[PDB]
């Protein structure tokens with residue numbers, strides 16, 4: 001259904017480690033979509049795997065997950081086509097917005113945790129990559145998650161900087177899982193709250209950095225400037241220990257979101 005020649009570059013939405021994304025127009029349909037090119041030097045068998053595994057994204061419908069239209073391969077570059085969210089990613093919003101208010105972070109948290117639990121229950125997958133830039137917003141006030149790990153093979157093929165939102169345990173070994181996403185969210189809401197990457201507490205090299213998050217105490221929210229309920233919420237996400245750390249059920253019925 002989706003083909004390379006059937007598209008038309010409109011503008012460029014942004015870029016990261018391994019992917020470029022364009023605001024594009026799907027001629028046959030008129031739909032404005034976001035198209036993500038991932039450059040992969042890869043053999044036909046696996047190139048087909050990744051595509052085959054991306055089909056699952058047709059079954060990912062939630063108001064908390066970014067819509068998916070199709071995926072295909074075109075000249076050394078794999079394509080994922082998705083809902084264009086005309087507000088961009090929270091990392092952008094933060095840059096232009098200085099710091100994001102506690103009340104809004106509240107709406108954001110609701111969405112992220114609803115999004116995570118949907119991917120867990122209905123599809124049995126962890127997100128693996130939650131952080132401000134993988135949470136998209138749109139003018140209809142929607143707040144959706146993208147770039148979650150639906151395809152093992154694509155994670156593989158992409159085995160290949162500054163900030164990390166990876167959990168202490170994921171940083172330390174392969175002994176991690178869905179609990180790891182919670183830490184990410186924790187860290188992301190702290191970032192967006194204060195307007196700055198919260199490590200170290202208010203220019204740091206890779207080991208300094210990575211060593212801080214695994215050996216030094218977790219970041220906390222500034223005091224007095226944020227409700228005690230926001231504090232406890234973040235605090236329960238950022239607990240070094242995966243088992244002690246809040247799980248998805250517990251955060252759903254936490255005070256902070258209840259207030260939200």
Ligand SMILES: Nc1ncnc2c1ncn2[C@@H]1O[C@H](COP(=O)(O)OP(=O)(O)OP(=O)(O)O)[C@@H](O)[C@H]1O
Nearest residue numbers: 013014015016017019021034082083084085089133
């Ligand atoms: N569906 C979409 N709708 C609107 N904007 C998008 C969409 N997907 C990505 N973007 C924007 O384009 C950028 C592309 O992000 P991409 O996933 O390629 O790298 P990243 O996630 O920002 O960072 P990294 O890959 O380094 O983790 C994002 O920062 C976001 O601003």
Ligand SMILES: O=C(NOCCO)C1=CC=C(F)C(F)/C1=N\c1ccc(I)cc1F
Nearest residue numbers: 016018019066080146147148149150151154
């Ligand atoms: O984009 C990724 N990582 O981002 C890194 C910068 O390219 C991805 C990594 C692993 C996967 F399985 C992915 F599907 C995936 N991409 C998407 C997943 C869901 C939607 I809705 C849209 C996506 F684009």
Ligand SMILES: [Mg+2]
Nearest residue numbers: 133134146147
């Ligand atoms: Mg992304």
